[PDB]
Amino acid sequence: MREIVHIQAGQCGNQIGAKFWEVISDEHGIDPTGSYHGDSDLQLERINVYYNEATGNKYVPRAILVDLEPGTMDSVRSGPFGQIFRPDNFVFGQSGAGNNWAKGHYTEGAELVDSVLDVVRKESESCDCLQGFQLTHSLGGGTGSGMGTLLISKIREEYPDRIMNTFSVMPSPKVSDTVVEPYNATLSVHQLVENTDETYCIDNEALYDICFRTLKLTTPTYGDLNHLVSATMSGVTTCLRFPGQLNADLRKLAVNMVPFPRLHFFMPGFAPLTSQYRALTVPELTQQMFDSKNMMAACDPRHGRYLTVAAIFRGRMSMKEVDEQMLNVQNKNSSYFVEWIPNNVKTAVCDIPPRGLKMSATFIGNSTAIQELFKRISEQFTAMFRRKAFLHWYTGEGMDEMEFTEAESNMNDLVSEYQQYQDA
Amino acid sequence: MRECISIHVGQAGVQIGNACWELYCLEHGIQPDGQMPSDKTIGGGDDSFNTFFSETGAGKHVPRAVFVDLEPTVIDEVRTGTYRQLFHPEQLITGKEDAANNYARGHYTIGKEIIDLVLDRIRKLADQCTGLQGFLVFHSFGGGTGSGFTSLLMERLSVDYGKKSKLEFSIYPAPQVSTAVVEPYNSILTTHTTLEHSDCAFMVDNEAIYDICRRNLDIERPTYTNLNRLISQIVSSITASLRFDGALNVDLTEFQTNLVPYPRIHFPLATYAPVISAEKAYHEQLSVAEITNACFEPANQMVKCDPRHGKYMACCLLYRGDVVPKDVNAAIATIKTKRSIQFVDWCPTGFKVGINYQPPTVVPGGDLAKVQRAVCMLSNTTAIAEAWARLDHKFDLMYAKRAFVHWYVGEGMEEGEFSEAREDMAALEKDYEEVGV
Amino acid sequence: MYTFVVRDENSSVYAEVSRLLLATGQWKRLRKDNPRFNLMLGERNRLPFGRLGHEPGLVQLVNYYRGADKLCRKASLVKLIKTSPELSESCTWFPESYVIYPGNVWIAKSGILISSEAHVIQKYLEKPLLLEPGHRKFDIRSWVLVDHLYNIYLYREGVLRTSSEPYNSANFQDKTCHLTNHCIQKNYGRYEEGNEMFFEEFNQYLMDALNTTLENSILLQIKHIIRSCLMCIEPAISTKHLHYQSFQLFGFDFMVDEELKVWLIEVNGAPACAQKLYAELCQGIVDVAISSVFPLASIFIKLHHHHHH
Amino acid sequence: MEVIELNKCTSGQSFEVILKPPDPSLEEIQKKLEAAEERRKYQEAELLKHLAE
Lengths: 424, 437, 309, 53
Ligand SMILES: Nc1nc2c(ncn2[C@@H]2O[C@H](COP(=O)(O)OP(=O)(O)OP(=O)(O)O)[C@@H](O)[C@H]2O)c(=O)[nH]1
Ligand SMILES: Nc1ncnc2c1ncn2[C@@H]1O[C@H](COP(=O)(O)OP(=O)(O)CP(=O)(O)O)[C@@H](O)[C@H]1O
Ligand SMILES: Nc1nc2c(ncn2[C@@H]2O[C@H](COP(=O)(O)OP(=O)(O)O)[C@@H](O)[C@H]2O)c(=O)[nH]1
Ligand SMILES: COc1cc([C@H]2C(C#N)=C(N)Oc3c2ccc(N)c3N)cc(Br)c1OC
Ligand SMILES: [Ca+2]
Ligand SMILES: [Mg+2]
Ligand SMILES: [Mg+2]
Fold this sequence. Notes:
Chain B is α/β, with parallel strands linked by helices. In chain B, 41% of the residues lie in helices and 17% in strands.
């Protein structure tokens, strides 16, 4: 259980996907040409998880780069770390998906999916022990959403026994490309409830609010939102990437976090929220990573209960002080955990801090309060679908209304299922 | 003499294995390369220590050990570590994919595809034995491999060695040093499936050991290394009688006779004293009276429970160091008056005593100070049922909601195996209460 | 903020201890099955002591001593007094009691048979002490609080549970003059309110009719019997060096005979506090047994006597 | 309190002190290991059938 295959699909997928490779490459001491120049040996002990070793002692991300249009992928090559990616692993169409799920999933996307799978297969073949896949994408457009979910379906057919992990950016009217975002996101969630083991809900509403309210940025850009996303992605992959004493993998993440197969949508958290000089104290990190204002999914965790929780502290600190602070919230806020999963909070500590910060915490919560995110997309869906508004973009690609009713129903079902366990 | 085979399953099994074999080698004067200078019979022997070590012509002393882990990272540290020359690679068995803290995946899925191979390496060891006694099996309750693969081996050992004794050293799960949320599930399942296959089981609560390391060794945050060096001392006390000259607990059969009259109720409580910090500048050495008394303090038990609220079926006192019987009896007299040591009506209120004049060996640069005398008590007390109740209650809070069950069913295991395993454990709790009140 | 749970409904005393605890602003009550408490206020039967003291980062207290049942059942009290060297078979302050399983007047109990003909048979006190005017029987009830360090605290307020009918020699079957409970007696309240005389008035009656005080005539013997009983079982039930901690409120029941000798009748493991007194006692429980272990932001006489021999 | 069965040697001594007197077959295992692989293969069939739809 060692190699992870990373897929990044569409504009958002390839943008947050690009940042992640810039951030971890710098943590593992890999340079914009793929040459090691670090100091610590810790930086190479589990490098194999995210990198292939090539000729000349080069490190090549196990990264596949997908888009139906050539634009954003020429931007990745242009961009600061663009030379590190295996060139045979860029796969792109010409016509784009135009924010149309049906085009991603069923027409334009169908034509391209087979040639992405071939690159996936190629990466899977020269893997000593594949743990599975992590995909970066938005649910709000056509390619990341529609073609990303088509790929997930096809990877599961060919690899039923490997783990499927997503970083899934939810759309917000506060960062809106188009009115059809709730449509593309509802169709995409149905796919994600059936065919992923773990999904990190990166809510664009949350990223915006954190940038406006709790960071005093009046006009947040995708650059600002993505800074928070790449910090979270660095955080939640720390234990996959570095030794040790946890030695985590994607299956053990799944077994420990998901008590019911459908309830695998994680509320990620980060502390301290940046865009410092004073390092935070362990109690500050602890209070902040459990605070609403620090979650990357716009949900009130006081409206729900935590089923499971994983926390990763980075820097130099007493594990004793981490333990004490992690038991202090559990023993003084027991109402907001379920009594019927004993010892449901797990803490881990890594000595290597992220770039800039001296100590940081990353939160991963399977909270029933995630329902508020799905209900919000449901309501934006119903407000259009009840007048069949903007459907013709989807019927014109061969979709029926039926398939919209089905995706509406499966998302209201997911919301009830979260409700069930909030009152139990 | 009669040979014993030690099987270490999972990370806990294997790391505890390493500590035990480190200590045995120091106790017997065997070096990391496996040469035993004090041993005058070269290429063989029917000495007591030969029950645990085989011998080669070139004069190497080789543990009668099998190490099994479904993943390689932990047994790889044995292969590349201080005691690499000691073991034969055929004894160190690793898969690739671990059980991901899943009983079902350790038993049914990844189990079925490695059992036949382990049994074969076990059989090669049995074939170098003149008169095999049976097996010492080290494992966690909590790991998918420790739980699931262990219970599969114990079924196949029962079939392939019906005559032979099977003893367990089991690590009972503790939230303070815990891997997975599903340890309760894995713990019940492996108990149910191992119950009828095990003759005597020595449970160590990781909570009890962790606290003994906090309280008595002044370690803020104890590590598996600290825990394992202490556990290996208790394990050595218990197995001393198999590896040295004496007349108490001399073969595996006698462990059952002396400690388990009622065969399902076969979990003896280990109590150990004294545990003294090596950092500790000034230490007044404890007497026989003081260390015997320490055996009835719950804070020194391998499992936290109250022996005052339950009945004894057996009590063995295993002394190491400067101890003579008159001091032992004087101590037992004093303590009878001052304490609540109720036995069952159909058992003699009696202590079986073993003394070995060699004090405990400590690992150099270890945490445990050298002492003039130490003792390990083995009481079969119904009070240990407290550990079953605690574990069973945790199982019930999660199973009531079928939480994580789908992870086990997804490997071919049925829901019913859970209720079945839990009913067996409900029966064991009742067995303990009839006998205990 | 500390945390507690309730698992005893009928408990009037821990109803009030719960109420006082909430109304403090530093104590949240949780649901009955929530494992992360500081204090448990536990059920009368089958209390799961095995589960206590295993929760990391939590010091756990419970309001019962495990094995204190042996002092509280009639069947085991008798057996405890007959088989303990510290309370001998020839113990001066326990009425001769016997166990056979399903002046020579006796009484049987666990429907109460008093005859010479006909559970535990007990020597019945043919000549007890009678309050004038009345020629009528009573029983004294003292509330004792054993904390986590096994300090023994007597509450300075007890109470008499009086009859209201002339006690009778030849008439045994009749149950309102012989037996001086509270439930069987509800001439109800003719002489004193609710059949409940208190320590001030009983100290006065004694001074006027018997010239002695309550301290001298009765309370010295009470303090000896409470001390004898709880120091007997201290080795069995003490939670010193244990992974959880116990306290418990006990109610001791006593009789006074004509020559002013104090006998022990029963020890009550889940006792009911008298209506007027609840306020003071329940605040005491909290001050001494609970705030001692869980500090925030004397109504008790402490029992100890080390005579050197 | 009577000290019985005392045995001495040069490494130590042992004695008893008394205060007061008073498995299924290979067939059945390979059977149920296979019944669970048949439940495991069915579940994976049902999954492929559903992905074909
Ligand atoms: N005392 C002690 N307990 C250990 C040790 N290693 C693991 N444990 C405990 O064992 C349980 C976890 O099981 P492991 O032995 O790590 O798992 P495994 O058998 O390797 O199984 P998988 O990795 O799940 O395939 C937890 O209760 C841990 O606290 C160790 O070296 N010493
Ligand atoms: N040996 C004896 N001599 C005289 N009176 C006795 C007696 N034994 C019992 N009694 C009387 O009967 C009553 C006994 O009540 P008992 O203690 O048997 O049960 P109970 O349920 O009332 C316990 P509690 O009163 O503490 O709630 C007392 O009021 C007492 O006067
Ligand atoms: N956080 C974040 N969101 C993005 C980014 N780019 C686009 N989005 C969002 O993603 C959705 C549009 O999807 P996009 O990835 O551009 O569509 P596709 O390229 O056709 O898959 C909308 O909800 C946008 O607000 C980005 O770089 N970061
Ligand atoms: C603390 O960070 C992570 C935890 C886990 C996952 C896991 C692994 N590997 C272990 N063994 O147990 C848990 C785990 C998660 C939650 C809980 N409650 C538990 N017990 C996986 C990863 Br990846 C972690 O880092 C992100
Ligand atoms: Ca030899
Ligand atoms: Mg766009
Ligand atoms: Mg393991």
